[PDB]
mmCIF file of N, CA, C and O and ligand atoms in Angstrom:
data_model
loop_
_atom_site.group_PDB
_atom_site.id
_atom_site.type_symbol
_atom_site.label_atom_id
_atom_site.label_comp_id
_atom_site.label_asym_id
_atom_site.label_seq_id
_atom_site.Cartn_x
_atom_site.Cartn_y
_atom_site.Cartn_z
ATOM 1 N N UNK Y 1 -15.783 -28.564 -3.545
ATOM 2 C CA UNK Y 1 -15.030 -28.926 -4.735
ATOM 3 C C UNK Y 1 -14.382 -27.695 -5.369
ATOM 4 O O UNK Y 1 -13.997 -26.716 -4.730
ATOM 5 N N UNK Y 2 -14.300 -27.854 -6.744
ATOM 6 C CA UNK Y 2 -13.576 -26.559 -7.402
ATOM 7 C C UNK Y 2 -14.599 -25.654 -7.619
ATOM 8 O O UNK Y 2 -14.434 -24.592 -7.020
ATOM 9 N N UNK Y 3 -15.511 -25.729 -8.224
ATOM 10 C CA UNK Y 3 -16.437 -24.968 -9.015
ATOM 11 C C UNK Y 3 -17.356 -24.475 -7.808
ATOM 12 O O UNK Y 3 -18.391 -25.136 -7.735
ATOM 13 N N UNK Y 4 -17.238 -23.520 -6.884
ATOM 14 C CA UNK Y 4 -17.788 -23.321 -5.557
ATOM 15 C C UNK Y 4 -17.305 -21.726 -5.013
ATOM 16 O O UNK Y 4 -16.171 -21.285 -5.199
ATOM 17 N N UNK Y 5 -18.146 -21.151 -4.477
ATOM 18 C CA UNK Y 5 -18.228 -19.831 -4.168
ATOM 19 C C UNK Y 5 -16.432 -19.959 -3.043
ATOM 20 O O UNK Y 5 -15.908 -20.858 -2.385
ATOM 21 N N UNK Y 6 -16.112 -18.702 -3.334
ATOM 22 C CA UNK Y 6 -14.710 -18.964 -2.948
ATOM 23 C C UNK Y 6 -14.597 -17.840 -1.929
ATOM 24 O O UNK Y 6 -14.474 -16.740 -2.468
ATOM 25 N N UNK Y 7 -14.607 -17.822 -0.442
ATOM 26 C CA UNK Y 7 -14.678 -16.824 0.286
ATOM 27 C C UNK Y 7 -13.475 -15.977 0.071
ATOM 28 O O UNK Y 7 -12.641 -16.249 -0.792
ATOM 29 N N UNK Y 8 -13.363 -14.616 1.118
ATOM 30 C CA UNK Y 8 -12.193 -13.998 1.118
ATOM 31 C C UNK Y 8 -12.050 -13.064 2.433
ATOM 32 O O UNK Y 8 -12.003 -11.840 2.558
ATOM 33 N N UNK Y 9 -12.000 -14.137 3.371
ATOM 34 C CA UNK Y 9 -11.280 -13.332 4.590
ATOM 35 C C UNK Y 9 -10.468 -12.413 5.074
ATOM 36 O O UNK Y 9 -10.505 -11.393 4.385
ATOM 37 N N UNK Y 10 -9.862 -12.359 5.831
ATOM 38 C CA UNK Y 10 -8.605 -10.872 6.201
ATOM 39 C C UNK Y 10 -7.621 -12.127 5.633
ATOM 40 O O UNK Y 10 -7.547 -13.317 5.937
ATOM 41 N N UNK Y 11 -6.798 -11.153 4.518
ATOM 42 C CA UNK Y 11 -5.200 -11.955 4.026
ATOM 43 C C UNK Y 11 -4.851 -10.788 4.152
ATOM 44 O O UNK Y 11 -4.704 -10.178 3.093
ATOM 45 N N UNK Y 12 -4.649 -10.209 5.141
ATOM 46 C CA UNK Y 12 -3.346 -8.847 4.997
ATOM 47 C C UNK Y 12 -1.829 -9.023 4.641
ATOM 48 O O UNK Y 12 -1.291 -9.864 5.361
ATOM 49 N N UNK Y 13 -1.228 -8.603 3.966
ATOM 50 C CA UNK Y 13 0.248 -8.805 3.382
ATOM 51 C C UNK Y 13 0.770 -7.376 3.065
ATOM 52 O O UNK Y 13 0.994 -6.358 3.721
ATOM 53 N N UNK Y 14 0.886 -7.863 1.404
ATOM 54 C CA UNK Y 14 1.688 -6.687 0.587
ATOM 55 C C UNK Y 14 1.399 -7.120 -0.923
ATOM 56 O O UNK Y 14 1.475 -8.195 -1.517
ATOM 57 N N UNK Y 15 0.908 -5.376 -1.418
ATOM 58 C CA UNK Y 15 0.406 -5.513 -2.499
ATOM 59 C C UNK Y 15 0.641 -4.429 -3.007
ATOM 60 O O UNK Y 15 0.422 -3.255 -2.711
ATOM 61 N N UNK Y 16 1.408 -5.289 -4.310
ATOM 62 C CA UNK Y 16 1.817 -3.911 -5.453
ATOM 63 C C UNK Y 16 0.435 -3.393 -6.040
ATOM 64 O O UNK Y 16 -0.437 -4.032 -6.629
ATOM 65 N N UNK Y 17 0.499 -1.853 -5.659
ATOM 66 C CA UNK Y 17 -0.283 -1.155 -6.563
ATOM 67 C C UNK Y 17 -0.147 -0.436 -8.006
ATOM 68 O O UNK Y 17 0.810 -1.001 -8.535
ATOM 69 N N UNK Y 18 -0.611 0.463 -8.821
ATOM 70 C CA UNK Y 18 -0.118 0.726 -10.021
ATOM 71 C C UNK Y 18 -1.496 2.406 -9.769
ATOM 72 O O UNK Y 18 -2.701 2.553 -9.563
ATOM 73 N N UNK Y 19 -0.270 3.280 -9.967
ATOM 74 C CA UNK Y 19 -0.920 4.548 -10.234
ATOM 75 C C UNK Y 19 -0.027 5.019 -11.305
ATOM 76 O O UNK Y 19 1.166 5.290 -11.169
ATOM 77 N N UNK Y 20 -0.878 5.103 -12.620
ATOM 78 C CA UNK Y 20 -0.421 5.923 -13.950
ATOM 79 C C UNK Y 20 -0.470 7.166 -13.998
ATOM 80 O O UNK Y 20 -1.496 7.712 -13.592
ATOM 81 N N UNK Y 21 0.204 7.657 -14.313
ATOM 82 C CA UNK Y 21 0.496 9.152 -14.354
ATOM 83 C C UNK Y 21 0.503 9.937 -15.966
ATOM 84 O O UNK Y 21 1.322 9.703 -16.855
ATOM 85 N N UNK Y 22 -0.657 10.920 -16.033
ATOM 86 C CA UNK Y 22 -0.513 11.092 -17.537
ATOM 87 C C UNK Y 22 0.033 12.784 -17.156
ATOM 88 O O UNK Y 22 -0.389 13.776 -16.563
ATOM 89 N N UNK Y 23 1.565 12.220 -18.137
ATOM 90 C CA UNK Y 23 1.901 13.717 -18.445
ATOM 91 C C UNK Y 23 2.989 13.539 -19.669
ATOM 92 O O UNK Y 23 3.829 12.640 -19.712
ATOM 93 N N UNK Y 24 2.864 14.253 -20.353
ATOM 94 C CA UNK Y 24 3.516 14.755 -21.715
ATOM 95 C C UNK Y 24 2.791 13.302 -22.636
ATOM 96 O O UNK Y 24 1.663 12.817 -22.547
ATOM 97 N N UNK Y 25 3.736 12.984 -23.332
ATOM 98 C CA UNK Y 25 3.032 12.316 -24.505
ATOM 99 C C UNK Y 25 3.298 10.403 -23.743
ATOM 100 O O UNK Y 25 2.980 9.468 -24.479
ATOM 101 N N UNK Y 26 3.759 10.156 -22.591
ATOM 102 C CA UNK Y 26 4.133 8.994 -21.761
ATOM 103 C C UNK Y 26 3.469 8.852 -20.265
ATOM 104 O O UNK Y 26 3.441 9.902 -19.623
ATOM 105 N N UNK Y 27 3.127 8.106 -19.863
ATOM 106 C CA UNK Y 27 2.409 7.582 -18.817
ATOM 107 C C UNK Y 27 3.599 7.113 -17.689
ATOM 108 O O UNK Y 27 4.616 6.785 -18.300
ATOM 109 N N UNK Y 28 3.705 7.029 -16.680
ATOM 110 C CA UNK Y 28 4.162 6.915 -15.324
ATOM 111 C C UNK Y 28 3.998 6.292 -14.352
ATOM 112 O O UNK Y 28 3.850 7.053 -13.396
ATOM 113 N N UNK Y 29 3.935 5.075 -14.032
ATOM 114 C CA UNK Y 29 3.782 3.961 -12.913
ATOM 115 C C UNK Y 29 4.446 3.825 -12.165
ATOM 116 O O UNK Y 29 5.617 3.455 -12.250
ATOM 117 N N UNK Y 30 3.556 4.225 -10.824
ATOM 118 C CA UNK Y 30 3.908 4.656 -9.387
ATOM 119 C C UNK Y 30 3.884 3.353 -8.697
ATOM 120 O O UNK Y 30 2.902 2.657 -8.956
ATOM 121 N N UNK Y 31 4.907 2.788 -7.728
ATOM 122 C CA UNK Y 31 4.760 1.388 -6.862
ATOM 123 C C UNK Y 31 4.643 1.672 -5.535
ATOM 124 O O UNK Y 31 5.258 2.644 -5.096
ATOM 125 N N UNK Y 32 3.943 0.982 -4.787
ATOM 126 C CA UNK Y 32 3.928 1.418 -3.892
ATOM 127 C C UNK Y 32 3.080 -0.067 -3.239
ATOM 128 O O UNK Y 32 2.938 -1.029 -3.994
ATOM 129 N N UNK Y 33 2.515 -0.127 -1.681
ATOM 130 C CA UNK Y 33 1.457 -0.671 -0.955
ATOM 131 C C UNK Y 33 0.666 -0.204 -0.601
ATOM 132 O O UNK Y 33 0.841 0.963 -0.252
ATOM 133 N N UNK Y 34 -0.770 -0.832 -0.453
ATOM 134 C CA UNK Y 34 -2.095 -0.440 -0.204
ATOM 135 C C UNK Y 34 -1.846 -0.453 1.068
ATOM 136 O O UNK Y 34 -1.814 0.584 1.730
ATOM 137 N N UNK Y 35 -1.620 -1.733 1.606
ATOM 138 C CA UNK Y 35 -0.897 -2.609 1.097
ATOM 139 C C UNK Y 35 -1.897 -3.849 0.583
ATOM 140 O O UNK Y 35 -1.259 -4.580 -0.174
ATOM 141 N N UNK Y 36 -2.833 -4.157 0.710
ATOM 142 C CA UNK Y 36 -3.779 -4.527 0.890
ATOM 143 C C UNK Y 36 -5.305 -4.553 1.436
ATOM 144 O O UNK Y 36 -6.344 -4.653 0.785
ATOM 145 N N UNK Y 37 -5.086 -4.411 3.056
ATOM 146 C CA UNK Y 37 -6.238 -4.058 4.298
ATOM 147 C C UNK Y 37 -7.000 -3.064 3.408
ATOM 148 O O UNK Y 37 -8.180 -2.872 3.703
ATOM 149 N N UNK Y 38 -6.386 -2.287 2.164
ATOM 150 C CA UNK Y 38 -6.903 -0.822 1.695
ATOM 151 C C UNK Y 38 -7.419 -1.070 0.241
ATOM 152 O O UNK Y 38 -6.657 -1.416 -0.661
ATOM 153 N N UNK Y 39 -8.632 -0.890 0.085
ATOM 154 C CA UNK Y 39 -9.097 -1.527 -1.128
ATOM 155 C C UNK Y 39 -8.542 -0.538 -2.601
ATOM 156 O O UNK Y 39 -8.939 0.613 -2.781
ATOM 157 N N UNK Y 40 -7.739 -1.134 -3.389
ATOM 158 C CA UNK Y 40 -6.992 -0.940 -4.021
ATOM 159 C C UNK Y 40 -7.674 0.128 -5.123
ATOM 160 O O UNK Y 40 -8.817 -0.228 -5.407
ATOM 161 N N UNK Y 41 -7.414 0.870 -5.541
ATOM 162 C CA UNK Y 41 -7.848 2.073 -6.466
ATOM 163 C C UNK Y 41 -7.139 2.137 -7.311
ATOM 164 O O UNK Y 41 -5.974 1.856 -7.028
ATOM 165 N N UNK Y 42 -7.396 2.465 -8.529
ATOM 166 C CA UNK Y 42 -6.924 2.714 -10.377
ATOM 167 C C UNK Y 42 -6.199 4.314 -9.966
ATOM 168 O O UNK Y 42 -6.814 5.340 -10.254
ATOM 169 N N UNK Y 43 -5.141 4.354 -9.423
ATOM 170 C CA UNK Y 43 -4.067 5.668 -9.063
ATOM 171 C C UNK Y 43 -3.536 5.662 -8.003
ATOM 172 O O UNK Y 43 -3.904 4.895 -7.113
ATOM 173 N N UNK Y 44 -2.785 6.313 -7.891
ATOM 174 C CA UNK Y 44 -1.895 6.738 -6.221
ATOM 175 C C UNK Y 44 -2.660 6.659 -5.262
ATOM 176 O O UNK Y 44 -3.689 7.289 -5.504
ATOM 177 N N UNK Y 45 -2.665 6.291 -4.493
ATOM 178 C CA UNK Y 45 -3.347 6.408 -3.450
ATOM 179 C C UNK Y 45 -2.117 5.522 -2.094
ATOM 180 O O UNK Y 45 -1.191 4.723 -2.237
ATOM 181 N N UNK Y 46 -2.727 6.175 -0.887
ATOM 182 C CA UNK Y 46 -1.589 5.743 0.318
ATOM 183 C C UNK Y 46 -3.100 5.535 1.318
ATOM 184 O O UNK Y 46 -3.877 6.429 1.654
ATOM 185 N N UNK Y 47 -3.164 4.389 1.565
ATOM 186 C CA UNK Y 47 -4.131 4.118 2.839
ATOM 187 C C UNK Y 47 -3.508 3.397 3.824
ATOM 188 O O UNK Y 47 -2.819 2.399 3.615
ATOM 189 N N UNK Y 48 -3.851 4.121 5.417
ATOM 190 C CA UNK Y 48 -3.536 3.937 6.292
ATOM 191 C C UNK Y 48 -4.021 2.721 7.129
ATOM 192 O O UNK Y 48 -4.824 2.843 8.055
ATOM 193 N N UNK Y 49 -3.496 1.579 6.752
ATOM 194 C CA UNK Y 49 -3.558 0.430 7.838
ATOM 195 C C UNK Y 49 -4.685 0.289 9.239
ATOM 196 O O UNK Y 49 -4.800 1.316 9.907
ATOM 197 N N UNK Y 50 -5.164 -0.436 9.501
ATOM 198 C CA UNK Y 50 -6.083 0.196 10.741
ATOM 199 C C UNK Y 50 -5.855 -1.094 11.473
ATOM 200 O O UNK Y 50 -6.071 -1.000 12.681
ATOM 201 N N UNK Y 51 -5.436 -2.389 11.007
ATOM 202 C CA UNK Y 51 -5.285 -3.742 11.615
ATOM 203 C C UNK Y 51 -3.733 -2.968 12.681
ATOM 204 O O UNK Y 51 -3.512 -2.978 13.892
ATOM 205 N N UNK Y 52 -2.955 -2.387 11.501
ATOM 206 C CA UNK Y 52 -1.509 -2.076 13.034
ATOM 207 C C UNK Y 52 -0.674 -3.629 12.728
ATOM 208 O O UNK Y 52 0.308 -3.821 13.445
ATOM 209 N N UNK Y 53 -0.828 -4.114 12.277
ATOM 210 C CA UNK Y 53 0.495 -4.759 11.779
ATOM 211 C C UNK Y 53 0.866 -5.597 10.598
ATOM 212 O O UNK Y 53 1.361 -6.709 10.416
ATOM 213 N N UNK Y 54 0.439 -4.638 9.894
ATOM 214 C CA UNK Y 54 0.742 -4.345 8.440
ATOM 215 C C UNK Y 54 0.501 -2.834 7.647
ATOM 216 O O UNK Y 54 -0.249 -2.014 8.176
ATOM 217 N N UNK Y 55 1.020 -2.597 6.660
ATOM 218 C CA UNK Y 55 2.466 -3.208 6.448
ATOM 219 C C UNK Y 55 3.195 -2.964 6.984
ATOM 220 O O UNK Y 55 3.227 -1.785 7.334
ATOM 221 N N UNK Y 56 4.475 -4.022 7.510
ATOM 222 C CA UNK Y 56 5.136 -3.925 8.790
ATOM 223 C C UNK Y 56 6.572 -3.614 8.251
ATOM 224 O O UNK Y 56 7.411 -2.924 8.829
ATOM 225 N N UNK Y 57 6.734 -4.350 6.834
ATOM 226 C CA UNK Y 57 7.939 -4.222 5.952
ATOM 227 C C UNK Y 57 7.803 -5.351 4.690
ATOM 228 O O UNK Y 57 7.068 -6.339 4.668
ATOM 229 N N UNK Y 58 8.763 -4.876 3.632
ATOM 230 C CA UNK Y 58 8.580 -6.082 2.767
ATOM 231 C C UNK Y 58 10.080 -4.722 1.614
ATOM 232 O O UNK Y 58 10.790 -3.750 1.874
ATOM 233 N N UNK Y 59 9.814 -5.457 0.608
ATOM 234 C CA UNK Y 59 11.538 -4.711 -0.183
ATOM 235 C C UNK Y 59 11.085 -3.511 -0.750
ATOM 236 O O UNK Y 59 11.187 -3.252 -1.949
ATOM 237 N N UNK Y 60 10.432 -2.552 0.352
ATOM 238 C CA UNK Y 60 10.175 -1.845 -0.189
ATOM 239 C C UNK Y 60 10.230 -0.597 1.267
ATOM 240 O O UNK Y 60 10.809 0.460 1.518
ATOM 241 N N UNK Y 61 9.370 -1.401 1.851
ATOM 242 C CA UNK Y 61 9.454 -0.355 3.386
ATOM 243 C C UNK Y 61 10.630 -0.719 3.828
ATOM 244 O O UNK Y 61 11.368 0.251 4.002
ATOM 245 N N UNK Y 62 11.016 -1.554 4.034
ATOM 246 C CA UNK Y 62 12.349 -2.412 4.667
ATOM 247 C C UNK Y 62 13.448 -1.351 4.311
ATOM 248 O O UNK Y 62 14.009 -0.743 5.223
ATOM 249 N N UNK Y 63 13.696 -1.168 3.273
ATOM 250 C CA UNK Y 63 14.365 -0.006 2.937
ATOM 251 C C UNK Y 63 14.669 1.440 3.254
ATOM 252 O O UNK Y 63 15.657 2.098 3.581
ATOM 253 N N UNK Y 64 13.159 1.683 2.972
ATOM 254 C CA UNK Y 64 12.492 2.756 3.647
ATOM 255 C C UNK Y 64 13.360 3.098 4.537
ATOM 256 O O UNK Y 64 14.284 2.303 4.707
ATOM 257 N N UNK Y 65 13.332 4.733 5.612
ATOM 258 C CA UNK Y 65 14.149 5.056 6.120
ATOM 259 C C UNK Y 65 13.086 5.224 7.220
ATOM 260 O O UNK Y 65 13.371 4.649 8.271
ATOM 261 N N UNK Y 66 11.932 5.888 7.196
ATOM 262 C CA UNK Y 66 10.572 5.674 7.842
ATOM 263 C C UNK Y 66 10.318 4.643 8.204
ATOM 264 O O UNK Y 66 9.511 4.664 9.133
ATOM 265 N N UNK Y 67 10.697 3.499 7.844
ATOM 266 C CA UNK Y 67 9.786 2.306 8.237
ATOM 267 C C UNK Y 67 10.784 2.011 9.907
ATOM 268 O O UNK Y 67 10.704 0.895 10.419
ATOM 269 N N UNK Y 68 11.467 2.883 10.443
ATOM 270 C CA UNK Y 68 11.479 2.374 11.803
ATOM 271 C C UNK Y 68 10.813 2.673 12.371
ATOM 272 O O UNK Y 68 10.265 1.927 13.183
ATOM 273 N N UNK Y 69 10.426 4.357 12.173
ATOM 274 C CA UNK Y 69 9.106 4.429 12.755
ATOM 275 C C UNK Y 69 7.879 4.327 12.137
ATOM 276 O O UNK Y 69 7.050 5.237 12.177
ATOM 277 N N UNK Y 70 7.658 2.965 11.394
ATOM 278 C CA UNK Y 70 6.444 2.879 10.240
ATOM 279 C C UNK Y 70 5.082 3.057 11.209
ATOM 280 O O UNK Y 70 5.034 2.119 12.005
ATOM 281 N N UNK Y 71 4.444 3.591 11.300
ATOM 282 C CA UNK Y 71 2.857 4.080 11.556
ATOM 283 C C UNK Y 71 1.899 2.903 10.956
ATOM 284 O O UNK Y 71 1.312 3.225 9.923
ATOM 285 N N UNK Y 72 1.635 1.501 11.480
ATOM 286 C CA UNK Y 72 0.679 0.642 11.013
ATOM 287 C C UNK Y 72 -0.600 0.925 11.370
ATOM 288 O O UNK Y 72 -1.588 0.430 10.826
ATOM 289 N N UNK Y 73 -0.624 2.028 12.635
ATOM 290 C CA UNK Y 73 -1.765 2.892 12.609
ATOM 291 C C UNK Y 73 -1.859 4.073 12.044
ATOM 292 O O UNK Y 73 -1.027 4.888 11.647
ATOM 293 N N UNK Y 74 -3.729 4.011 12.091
ATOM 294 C CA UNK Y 74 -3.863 5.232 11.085
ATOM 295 C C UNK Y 74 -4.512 6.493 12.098
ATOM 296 O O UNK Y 74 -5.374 7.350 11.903
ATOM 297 N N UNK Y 75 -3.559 6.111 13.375
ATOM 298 C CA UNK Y 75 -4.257 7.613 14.165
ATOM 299 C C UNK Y 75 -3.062 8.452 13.510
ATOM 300 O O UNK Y 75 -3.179 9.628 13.853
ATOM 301 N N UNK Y 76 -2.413 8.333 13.028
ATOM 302 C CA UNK Y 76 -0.947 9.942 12.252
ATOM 303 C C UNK Y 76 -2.102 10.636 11.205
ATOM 304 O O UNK Y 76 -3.003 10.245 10.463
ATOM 305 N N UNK Y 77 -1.596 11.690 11.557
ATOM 306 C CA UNK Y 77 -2.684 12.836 10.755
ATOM 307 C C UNK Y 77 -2.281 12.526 9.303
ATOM 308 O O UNK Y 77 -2.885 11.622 8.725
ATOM 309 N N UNK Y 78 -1.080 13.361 8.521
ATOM 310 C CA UNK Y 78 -1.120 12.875 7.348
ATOM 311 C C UNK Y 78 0.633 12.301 7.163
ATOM 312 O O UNK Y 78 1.344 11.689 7.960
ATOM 313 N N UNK Y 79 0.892 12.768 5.866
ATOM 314 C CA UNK Y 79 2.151 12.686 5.452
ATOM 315 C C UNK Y 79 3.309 13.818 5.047
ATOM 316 O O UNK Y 79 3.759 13.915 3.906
ATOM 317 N N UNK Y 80 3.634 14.489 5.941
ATOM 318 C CA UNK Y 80 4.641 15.709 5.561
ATOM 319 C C UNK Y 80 5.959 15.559 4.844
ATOM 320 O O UNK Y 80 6.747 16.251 4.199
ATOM 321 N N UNK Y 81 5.821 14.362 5.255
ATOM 322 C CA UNK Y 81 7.727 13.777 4.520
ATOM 323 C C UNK Y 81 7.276 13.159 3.415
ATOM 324 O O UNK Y 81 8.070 12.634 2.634
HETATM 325 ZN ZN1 ZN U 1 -2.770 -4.037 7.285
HETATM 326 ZN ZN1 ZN U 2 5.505 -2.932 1.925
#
């Protein structure tokens, strides 16, 4: 019924995150994807995918100039660009 323990399997997608940024007398909200697979943290943070097909694109990587060669794995060392 409704009122019942509600599981939560693999839903991999795309998920806006929110990292605030405190500097001067105003705060700063960073967008970005976990995208999900990556358990979401209170700041910036970039976690590397380990499923490999996600995130694959969405209006954000799609754009992206990287996302042809988007890395859905997380064997790439880090991020230089
Ligand atoms: Zn994923
Ligand atoms: Zn995305």
């Amino acid at each position: 019924g409704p009122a019942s323990t509600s599981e939560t399997p693999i839903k991999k997608g795309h998920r806006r995150e929110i990292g605030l940024i405190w500097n001067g007398d105003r705060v700063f909200i960073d967008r970005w994807c976990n995208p999900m697979c990556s358990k979401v943290t209170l700041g910036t943070i970039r976690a590397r995918c380990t499923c490999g097909e996600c995130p694959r694109v969405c209006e954000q990587c799609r754009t992206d100039t990287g996302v042809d060669t988007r890395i859905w794995y997380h064997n790439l060392p880090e991020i230089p660009e």
